Amino acid sequence: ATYYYILASKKFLTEEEPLEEVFRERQRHYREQGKEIDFWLVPEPAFLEQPQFAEQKARCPQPAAAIISTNQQFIQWLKLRLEYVLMGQFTSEEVPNPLASLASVLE
Numbered sequence: 001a002t003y004y005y006i007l008a009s010k011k012f013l014t015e016e017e018p019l020e021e022v023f024r025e026r027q028r029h030y031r032e033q034g035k036e037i038d039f040w041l042v043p044e045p046a047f048l049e050q051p052q053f054a055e056q057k058a059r060c061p062q063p064a065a066a067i068i069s070t071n072q073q074f075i076q077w078l079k080l081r082l083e084y085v086l087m088g089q090f091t092s093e094e095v096p097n098p099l100a101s102l103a104s105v106l107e
Helices: 020-033 051-059 072-082
Strands: 002-009 039-043 064-069 086-091
Touching: 002 072, 020 039, 051 086, 064 072, 072 086
Parallel strands: none
Antiparallel strands: 002 064, 002 086, 039 064
């Protein structure tokens, strides 16, 4: 499959543009429609360490987090709303575990 994503520092996603409610409202909407959740919060994304993402890893302040989704419009919407984030995409053949997180502590 193809995964679209926005990437930003956790600092930006906590002190300027928290996505907490965006996620919960969308999850509630999907539940009411009986739709399968296809968007996910991925802190310290494993994919960002792969060679093909070297440029974005250099540009994005760490620690970072990605919002990944198979719905491209949702990701484009996030970019329009947040602005100061990186955006991109990758396939299942390019990243073995698309949603893998390297986070080591629980919120």
